[PDB]
Amino acid sequence: QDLVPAAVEQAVPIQPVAGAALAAPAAGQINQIDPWIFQNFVQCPLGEFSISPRNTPGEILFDLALGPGLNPYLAHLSAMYTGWVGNMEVQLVLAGNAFTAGKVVVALVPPYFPKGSLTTAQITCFPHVMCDVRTLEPIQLPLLDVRRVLWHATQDQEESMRLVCMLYTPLRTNSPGDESFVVSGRLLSKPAADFNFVYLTPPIERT
Amino acid sequence: QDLVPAAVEQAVPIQPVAGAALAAPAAGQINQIDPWIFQNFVQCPLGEFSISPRNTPGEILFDLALGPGLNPYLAHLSAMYTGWVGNMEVQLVLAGNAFTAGKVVVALVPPYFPKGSLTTAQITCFPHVMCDVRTLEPIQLPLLDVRRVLWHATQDQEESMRLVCMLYTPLRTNSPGDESFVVSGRLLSKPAADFNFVYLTPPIERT
Amino acid sequence: EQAVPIQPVAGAALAAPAAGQINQIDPWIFQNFVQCPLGEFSISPRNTPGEILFDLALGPGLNPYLAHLSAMYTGWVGNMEVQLVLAGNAFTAGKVVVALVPPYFPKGSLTTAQITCFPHVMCDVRTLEPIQLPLLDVRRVLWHATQDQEESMRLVCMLYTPLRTNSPGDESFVVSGRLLSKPAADFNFVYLTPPIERT
Amino acid sequence: EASGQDLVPAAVEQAVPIQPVAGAALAAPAAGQINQIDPWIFQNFVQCPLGEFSISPRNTPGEILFDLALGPGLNPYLAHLSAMYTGWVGNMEVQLVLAGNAFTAGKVVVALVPPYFPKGSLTTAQITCFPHVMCDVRTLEPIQLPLLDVRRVLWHATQDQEESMRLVCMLYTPLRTNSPGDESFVVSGRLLSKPAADFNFVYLTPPIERT
């Protein structure tokens, strides 16, 4: 006998990817960061968007890319280093009342996947999480570092794992004053447990 | 003395059915699949429907059937094999605001049950789960493999356990702009812990 | 050469608990390869590769003695053992592939490439000894019923690589092949039954 | 024309001067998932998609009989699986079937040209400069030979624009026959393949339709 539940958490599963352990011998240095940067999220420099009843399902709300540019602290430290390697952790927040119905999908698109058009039927094929616009609490995901190079360079804009958000179900409400109720959405990020820069360097302050 | 609670999870109970353990001696092979296919749901190729205030209670919203056709990964691997056996796991998501009231029932209709008309009084007789249209999180169910044959054939459209969704309680709202508020609904699926194909075969790509 | 990527298929040890009886066969029948009813072909130098030389499914109809015994029982189950013979001297060249298609497969054309994807063997036309290989009873039911031909595992023989020989003014020197079969160690009939007249 | 041993059953694998090459073991700690292909695929050889070719007595020494690059496009199974993932690692094992008639004669050469080598000419003067084998068109047994993943990065994207150690078989000596009558046996050569010990893909993706 057994008993299967009918409601479980989302909890995207992963297989741990190595950070500095791969880039160690081929890098001149391995530079730590302030251990408190791992300790809270912070709004990504571009983590801003807004859903609207005039968005068709399938539209990509945002498409971020793993890197130190997702965290204003890492973005500031990146001026003193030539490259980076490791994982990060993102979270999303929405602003919707009980009148807005609709669901979006946040998926972890890997690198080297053909950058083209994604259908709603495809977006769920990736490791993902489904979030409806009525949620109050933030929703987090691990941005791993699937890569075939030992460590990326900061200033060269390497290709890494992306994170895409698609409007799964058409956002629609009842008929109060609507079509003027953009659901705002924000993104915050913080380095995962295995993030660190690669080579100390004069702060060039121009990146 | 004792104390019985008043609110528990749904958690449909099961008795484990054997997968490859039955089909082992009478099959030429037993082919594994990528162990990561077990690790996330993905929208069923036909997992799309929509409830409307113009649906009478009793209407069947969808009726799926156990098989590799519920998962685009299994559906793709099925071209290299002649048959399959095992269990799967489905989940359902809805898109409703706080104004839509109504409940549906998801039941596991067994094979060889007379394919006819099901009343609302009957739908709850099966192992089922009750879901109201206001739910935010997905709701999952185990699609077991009740069968009297050792293993089904992929290309012959065998008869297996179905999964039916009936509008239990009439979906109705208050009176904002309504009758134009179809509650979208989607289905995702993934192989259970005991799924595998039966016989390697040139990929015929035409199924 | 009897090494194909296949598992041992249980027969008559899987159908025993649900069969009323398990009837045996005259053991002499186990010791004589008999010509299958359509297990014969003849390759010509102009036969294009990819052709189907023979195709035949497992069942009691592959053996005259087994076909005669089938009229006396209700069901049958078990494997068989076949061998291919080719008539070619040392001055030939060309290959023939023999595959084991599963007992559920969309019928139609098979290119010379797909035929290799099954558990198969490749055979040169210069092989003296008969090529032996098993015919296992892959199935979903326990034991097949004698009075209705259901899907069973089939042998398919495809001309893989064309024939390269000289030939005199006549008659182009075909390479003829034949196929013989016999019951395996655990081929049995199920339920003794009065032999109905039109079987 | 007969079953005799007047042929060259040179199934001998001359020691190809090349070290072993690590496969998926290098990309495992860099892939976010755990992936694995059907073990039965590792069992039997199968004709490569473009696995057929033919040698005519009018072919000139130096003509490329075939030139095929390492990747999932060498097995129907692997090619079908490659539509589900994004990236692949590992080596391959290839059998060459050259069992021409006993009245024929001629030799070809198979070489493991490394990546980043300029494609194109590959003249007969330099085909032997690579780790190679010399094969006779009258060989009975299939000639086994490895296809290692000599690479610069961890894995190759399943979109195989990458550079992989391609394998090239070139006609070395002209094909000539010896039978007394008005006919030169054109020999039909085949190519079978199967994944090596630790060939593997990396990251699951939606199985695109038009691969």
Coordinates of N, CA and C in Angstrom, one line a residue, chain D residues 58-210:
Chain D
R58 N 37.2 2.9 -62.5 CA 37.5 4.2 -63.1 C 37.8 5.3 -62.0
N59 N 37.7 5.0 -60.8 CA 38.0 5.9 -59.7 C 39.5 6.1 -59.7
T60 N 40.0 7.3 -59.6 CA 41.4 7.7 -59.6 C 42.0 7.7 -58.2
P61 N 43.2 7.2 -58.0 CA 43.8 7.3 -56.6 C 43.8 8.7 -56.2
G62 N 43.4 8.9 -54.9 CA 43.3 10.3 -54.3 C 41.8 10.7 -54.1
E63 N 40.9 10.1 -54.8 CA 39.5 10.5 -54.7 C 39.0 10.1 -53.3
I64 N 38.3 11.0 -52.6 CA 37.8 10.8 -51.3 C 36.6 9.8 -51.4
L65 N 36.8 8.6 -50.9 CA 35.7 7.6 -50.9 C 34.7 8.1 -49.9
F66 N 35.1 8.5 -48.7 CA 34.2 9.2 -47.8 C 35.0 10.0 -46.8
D67 N 34.3 11.0 -46.2 CA 34.9 11.9 -45.2 C 33.7 12.3 -44.3
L68 N 33.7 11.7 -43.2 CA 32.5 11.9 -42.3 C 33.1 12.3 -40.9
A69 N 32.4 13.3 -40.3 CA 32.9 13.9 -39.0 C 32.2 13.2 -37.8
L70 N 33.0 13.2 -36.7 CA 32.4 12.6 -35.5 C 31.3 13.4 -35.0
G71 N 30.2 12.8 -34.6 CA 29.0 13.4 -34.1 C 27.9 12.4 -34.0
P72 N 26.7 12.9 -33.5 CA 25.6 12.0 -33.4 C 25.0 11.7 -34.7
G73 N 25.5 12.3 -35.8 CA 24.9 12.0 -37.1 C 25.5 10.8 -37.8
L74 N 26.1 9.9 -37.0 CA 26.7 8.7 -37.5 C 25.8 7.4 -37.1
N75 N 24.9 7.6 -36.2 CA 24.0 6.5 -35.9 C 22.5 7.0 -36.1
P76 N 21.7 6.2 -36.7 CA 20.2 6.6 -36.7 C 19.7 6.8 -35.3
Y77 N 20.1 5.9 -34.4 CA 19.7 6.1 -33.0 C 20.2 7.4 -32.4
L78 N 21.5 7.7 -32.6 CA 22.1 8.9 -32.0 C 21.6 10.1 -32.7
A79 N 21.4 10.0 -34.1 CA 20.8 11.2 -34.8 C 19.4 11.5 -34.3
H80 N 18.6 10.5 -34.0 CA 17.3 10.7 -33.5 C 17.3 11.3 -32.1
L81 N 18.2 10.8 -31.3 CA 18.3 11.3 -29.9 C 18.8 12.8 -29.9
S82 N 19.7 13.1 -30.9 CA 20.3 14.5 -30.8 C 19.3 15.6 -30.9
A83 N 18.0 15.3 -31.4 CA 17.0 16.3 -31.4 C 16.5 16.7 -30.0
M84 N 16.8 15.9 -29.0 CA 16.2 16.1 -27.7 C 17.2 16.9 -26.8
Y85 N 18.5 16.9 -27.1 CA 19.5 17.4 -26.2 C 20.1 18.6 -26.9
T86 N 21.0 19.3 -26.1 CA 21.9 20.4 -26.7 C 23.3 20.1 -26.3
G87 N 24.0 19.3 -27.0 CA 25.4 19.0 -26.8 C 25.6 17.5 -26.7
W88 N 26.8 17.1 -27.0 CA 27.2 15.7 -26.9 C 28.7 15.6 -26.7
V89 N 29.1 14.4 -26.2 CA 30.6 14.2 -25.9 C 30.9 12.8 -26.4
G90 N 32.1 12.4 -26.3 CA 32.4 10.9 -26.4 C 32.9 10.5 -27.7
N91 N 33.4 9.3 -27.8 CA 34.0 8.7 -29.0 C 32.9 7.9 -29.8
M92 N 33.4 7.1 -30.8 CA 32.6 6.3 -31.6 C 33.4 5.1 -32.1
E93 N 32.7 4.0 -32.5 CA 33.4 2.9 -33.0 C 32.8 2.6 -34.4
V94 N 33.6 2.5 -35.4 CA 33.1 2.4 -36.8 C 33.7 1.1 -37.4
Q95 N 32.8 0.3 -38.1 CA 33.2 -0.8 -38.9 C 33.1 -0.4 -40.4
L96 N 34.1 -0.8 -41.1 CA 34.1 -0.6 -42.6 C 34.0 -2.0 -43.2
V97 N 33.1 -2.1 -44.1 CA 32.8 -3.4 -44.8 C 33.3 -3.3 -46.2
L98 N 34.4 -3.9 -46.6 CA 35.0 -3.9 -47.9 C 35.3 -5.4 -48.2
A99 N 34.3 -6.1 -48.8 CA 34.5 -7.5 -49.0 C 34.4 -7.9 -50.5
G100 N 35.1 -7.1 -51.3 CA 35.0 -7.2 -52.7 C 35.4 -8.6 -53.2
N101 N 35.0 -8.8 -54.5 CA 35.2 -10.1 -55.1 C 36.7 -10.5 -55.1
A102 N 37.0 -11.8 -55.1 CA 38.4 -12.3 -55.1 C 39.1 -11.9 -56.3
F103 N 38.5 -11.6 -57.4 CA 39.1 -11.2 -58.7 C 39.5 -9.8 -58.7
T104 N 39.3 -9.0 -57.6 CA 39.6 -7.6 -57.6 C 41.0 -7.4 -56.9
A105 N 41.4 -6.1 -56.9 CA 42.7 -5.7 -56.3 C 42.7 -4.2 -56.2
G106 N 43.4 -3.8 -55.2 CA 43.5 -2.3 -54.9 C 43.4 -2.1 -53.4
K107 N 43.9 -0.9 -53.0 CA 44.0 -0.6 -51.6 C 43.5 0.8 -51.4
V108 N 42.9 1.0 -50.2 CA 42.5 2.3 -49.7 C 43.2 2.6 -48.4
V109 N 43.0 3.9 -48.0 CA 43.6 4.3 -46.7 C 42.6 5.1 -45.9
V110 N 42.5 4.8 -44.6 CA 41.6 5.5 -43.7 C 42.4 6.3 -42.7
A111 N 42.2 7.6 -42.5 CA 42.9 8.4 -41.7 C 42.0 9.2 -40.7
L112 N 42.6 9.5 -39.5 CA 41.9 10.3 -38.5 C 42.4 11.7 -38.5
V113 N 42.0 12.5 -39.5 CA 42.4 13.9 -39.6 C 41.8 14.6 -38.4
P114 N 42.7 15.4 -37.7 CA 42.2 16.0 -36.5 C 41.3 17.2 -36.8
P115 N 40.8 17.8 -35.7 CA 40.0 19.1 -35.9 C 40.9 20.2 -36.4
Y116 N 40.3 21.3 -36.8 CA 40.9 22.5 -37.2 C 41.9 22.3 -38.4
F117 N 41.9 21.1 -38.9 CA 42.7 20.9 -40.1 C 42.0 21.5 -41.3
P118 N 42.6 22.2 -42.2 CA 41.9 22.8 -43.3 C 41.2 21.7 -44.2
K119 N 39.9 21.8 -44.4 CA 39.2 20.9 -45.3 C 39.6 21.1 -46.7
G120 N 39.2 20.2 -47.6 CA 39.4 20.4 -49.0 C 40.3 19.4 -49.6
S121 N 41.6 19.8 -49.9 CA 42.4 19.0 -50.8 C 42.7 17.6 -50.2
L122 N 43.4 17.5 -49.1 CA 43.8 16.2 -48.5 C 44.3 15.3 -49.6
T123 N 45.4 15.7 -50.2 CA 46.0 14.9 -51.3 C 46.5 13.6 -50.9
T124 N 46.8 12.7 -51.8 CA 47.3 11.4 -51.5 C 48.7 11.4 -50.9
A125 N 49.4 12.5 -51.1 CA 50.7 12.6 -50.5 C 50.7 12.7 -49.0
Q126 N 49.6 13.3 -48.4 CA 49.6 13.6 -47.0 C 48.6 12.7 -46.3
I127 N 47.8 11.9 -47.0 CA 46.8 11.1 -46.3 C 47.5 10.1 -45.3
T128 N 48.7 9.7 -45.6 CA 49.4 8.8 -44.7 C 50.1 9.5 -43.6
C129 N 50.1 10.9 -43.6 CA 50.8 11.6 -42.5 C 50.0 11.5 -41.2
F130 N 48.7 11.3 -41.3 CA 47.9 11.1 -40.1 C 47.9 9.7 -39.6
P131 N 47.5 9.5 -38.4 CA 47.3 8.1 -37.9 C 46.3 7.4 -38.8
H132 N 46.7 6.4 -39.5 CA 46.0 5.8 -40.6 C 46.1 4.3 -40.6
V133 N 45.3 3.7 -41.5 CA 45.4 2.2 -41.7 C 45.3 2.0 -43.2
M134 N 46.0 1.0 -43.7 CA 45.9 0.6 -45.1 C 45.1 -0.6 -45.3
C135 N 44.0 -0.5 -46.1 CA 43.0 -1.6 -46.2 C 43.0 -2.1 -47.6
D136 N 42.8 -3.4 -47.7 CA 42.7 -4.1 -49.0 C 41.2 -4.3 -49.3
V137 N 40.8 -4.1 -50.6 CA 39.4 -4.1 -51.0 C 38.8 -5.5 -50.9
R138 N 39.7 -6.5 -50.6 CA 39.2 -7.9 -50.5 C 39.1 -8.4 -49.1
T139 N 39.0 -7.5 -48.1 CA 39.0 -8.0 -46.7 C 37.7 -8.6 -46.4
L140 N 37.8 -9.8 -45.7 CA 36.5 -10.5 -45.3 C 35.9 -9.8 -44.1
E141 N 36.5 -9.8 -43.0 CA 35.9 -9.3 -41.8 C 35.7 -7.8 -41.9
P142 N 34.7 -7.2 -41.2 CA 34.6 -5.8 -41.0 C 35.8 -5.2 -40.3
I143 N 36.3 -4.1 -40.7 CA 37.5 -3.4 -40.2 C 37.0 -2.5 -39.1
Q144 N 37.3 -2.8 -37.8 CA 36.9 -1.9 -36.8 C 38.0 -0.8 -36.6
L145 N 37.5 0.3 -36.2 CA 38.4 1.4 -36.0 C 37.8 2.5 -35.1
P146 N 38.5 3.2 -34.3 CA 37.9 4.2 -33.3 C 37.8 5.5 -34.0
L147 N 36.9 6.4 -33.4 CA 36.8 7.8 -33.8 C 36.7 8.5 -32.4
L148 N 37.9 9.0 -32.0 CA 38.0 9.7 -30.7 C 37.6 11.1 -30.8
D149 N 37.2 11.7 -29.7 CA 36.7 13.1 -29.6 C 37.9 14.0 -29.2
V150 N 38.9 14.1 -30.0 CA 40.0 15.0 -29.8 C 39.4 16.4 -29.9
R151 N 39.2 17.1 -28.7 CA 38.5 18.3 -28.7 C 39.2 19.3 -27.8
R152 N 38.9 20.6 -28.0 CA 39.5 21.7 -27.2 C 38.6 22.1 -26.0
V153 N 37.3 21.8 -26.1 CA 36.3 22.3 -25.1 C 35.7 21.1 -24.4
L154 N 34.8 21.3 -23.5 CA 34.3 20.2 -22.7 C 33.4 19.3 -23.6
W155 N 32.4 19.9 -24.3 CA 31.6 19.2 -25.1 C 31.2 20.0 -26.4
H156 N 30.6 19.3 -27.3 CA 30.2 20.0 -28.6 C 28.7 20.2 -28.6
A157 N 28.3 21.4 -29.0 CA 26.9 21.6 -29.1 C 26.2 20.7 -30.1
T158 N 25.0 20.2 -29.8 CA 24.3 19.3 -30.6 C 24.1 19.9 -32.0
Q159 N 24.1 21.2 -32.1 CA 24.3 21.8 -33.4 C 25.8 21.7 -33.8
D160 N 26.1 20.9 -34.7 CA 27.5 20.4 -34.8 C 28.3 21.2 -35.8
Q161 N 28.1 22.5 -35.8 CA 29.0 23.4 -36.5 C 30.4 23.3 -35.9
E162 N 30.6 22.6 -34.8 CA 31.9 22.5 -34.1 C 32.9 21.8 -35.0
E163 N 34.1 21.7 -34.6 CA 35.2 21.0 -35.2 C 35.4 19.7 -34.5
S164 N 35.3 18.6 -35.2 CA 35.5 17.3 -34.6 C 36.4 16.5 -35.4
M165 N 37.1 15.5 -34.8 CA 38.1 14.7 -35.5 C 37.4 13.8 -36.6
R166 N 37.3 14.3 -37.8 CA 36.6 13.6 -38.8 C 37.5 12.4 -39.3
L167 N 36.8 11.5 -39.9 CA 37.5 10.3 -40.4 C 37.3 10.2 -41.9
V168 N 38.4 10.0 -42.6 CA 38.4 10.1 -44.1 C 39.1 8.9 -44.7
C169 N 38.3 8.2 -45.6 CA 38.8 7.1 -46.3 C 39.0 7.5 -47.8
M170 N 40.2 7.3 -48.3 CA 40.6 7.7 -49.6 C 41.1 6.6 -50.4
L171 N 40.8 6.6 -51.7 CA 41.3 5.5 -52.6 C 42.8 5.7 -52.8
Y172 N 43.6 4.7 -52.5 CA 45.0 4.9 -52.6 C 45.6 4.2 -53.9
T173 N 45.2 3.0 -54.2 CA 45.6 2.4 -55.5 C 44.4 2.2 -56.4
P174 N 44.6 2.2 -57.7 CA 43.4 2.0 -58.6 C 42.8 0.6 -58.4
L175 N 41.5 0.6 -58.5 CA 40.8 -0.7 -58.4 C 40.8 -1.4 -59.7
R176 N 41.4 -2.6 -59.8 CA 41.5 -3.4 -61.0 C 41.0 -4.8 -60.7
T177 N 40.4 -5.4 -61.7 CA 40.0 -6.8 -61.6 C 40.8 -7.7 -62.4
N178 N 40.6 -9.0 -62.3 CA 41.4 -10.0 -62.8 C 40.7 -11.1 -63.5
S179 N 39.3 -11.1 -63.5 CA 38.6 -12.1 -64.2 C 38.6 -12.0 -65.7
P180 N 38.6 -13.1 -66.4 CA 38.9 -13.0 -67.9 C 37.8 -12.4 -68.7
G181 N 36.6 -12.1 -68.1 CA 35.5 -11.7 -69.0 C 34.9 -10.4 -68.8
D182 N 35.2 -9.4 -69.7 CA 34.4 -8.2 -70.0 C 33.6 -7.6 -68.8
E183 N 34.2 -7.5 -67.7 CA 33.5 -7.0 -66.5 C 34.5 -6.7 -65.4
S184 N 34.4 -5.6 -64.8 CA 35.2 -5.2 -63.6 C 34.2 -5.0 -62.4
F185 N 34.4 -5.8 -61.4 CA 33.5 -5.8 -60.3 C 33.6 -4.5 -59.5
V186 N 32.7 -3.6 -59.6 CA 32.6 -2.5 -58.7 C 32.3 -2.9 -57.3
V187 N 33.1 -2.5 -56.4 CA 32.9 -3.0 -55.0 C 32.1 -2.1 -54.2
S188 N 31.1 -2.6 -53.5 CA 30.2 -1.8 -52.7 C 30.6 -1.9 -51.2
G189 N 31.1 -0.8 -50.7 CA 31.5 -0.7 -49.3 C 30.5 -0.1 -48.4
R190 N 30.4 -0.6 -47.2 CA 29.4 -0.1 -46.2 C 30.1 0.4 -45.0
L191 N 29.3 1.1 -44.2 CA 29.9 1.8 -43.0 C 28.9 1.6 -41.8
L192 N 29.3 0.9 -40.8 CA 28.5 0.7 -39.6 C 29.1 1.4 -38.4
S193 N 28.3 1.8 -37.4 CA 28.9 2.5 -36.3 C 28.0 2.3 -35.1
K194 N 28.6 2.6 -33.9 CA 27.9 2.5 -32.7 C 28.7 3.4 -31.6
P195 N 28.0 3.9 -30.6 CA 28.7 4.8 -29.7 C 29.7 4.1 -28.9
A196 N 30.7 4.9 -28.5 CA 31.8 4.3 -27.7 C 31.4 4.1 -26.2
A197 N 32.3 3.8 -25.4 CA 32.0 3.5 -24.0 C 31.2 4.6 -23.3
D198 N 31.7 5.8 -23.4 CA 31.1 6.9 -22.7 C 30.7 8.1 -23.6
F199 N 30.1 7.8 -24.8 CA 29.4 8.8 -25.6 C 28.1 9.2 -24.8
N200 N 27.8 10.5 -24.9 CA 26.7 10.9 -24.1 C 26.3 12.3 -24.6
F201 N 25.0 12.6 -24.3 CA 24.5 14.0 -24.5 C 24.5 14.7 -23.2
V202 N 24.0 15.9 -23.1 CA 24.1 16.7 -21.9 C 22.8 17.2 -21.3
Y203 N 22.1 18.1 -22.1 CA 21.0 18.8 -21.5 C 19.8 18.6 -22.3
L204 N 18.7 18.2 -21.7 CA 17.5 17.9 -22.4 C 16.9 19.2 -22.9
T205 N 16.3 19.2 -24.1 CA 15.6 20.3 -24.8 C 14.4 19.8 -25.4
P206 N 13.5 20.7 -25.8 CA 12.3 20.3 -26.5 C 12.7 19.7 -27.8
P207 N 12.1 18.5 -28.1 CA 12.5 17.7 -29.3 C 12.0 18.4 -30.6
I208 N 12.7 19.4 -31.1 CA 12.4 20.1 -32.3 C 11.9 19.2 -33.4
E209 N 11.0 19.6 -34.2 CA 10.4 18.8 -35.3 C 11.4 18.7 -36.4
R210 N 11.7 19.9 -37.0 CA 12.5 19.9 -38.2 C 14.0 20.1 -37.8

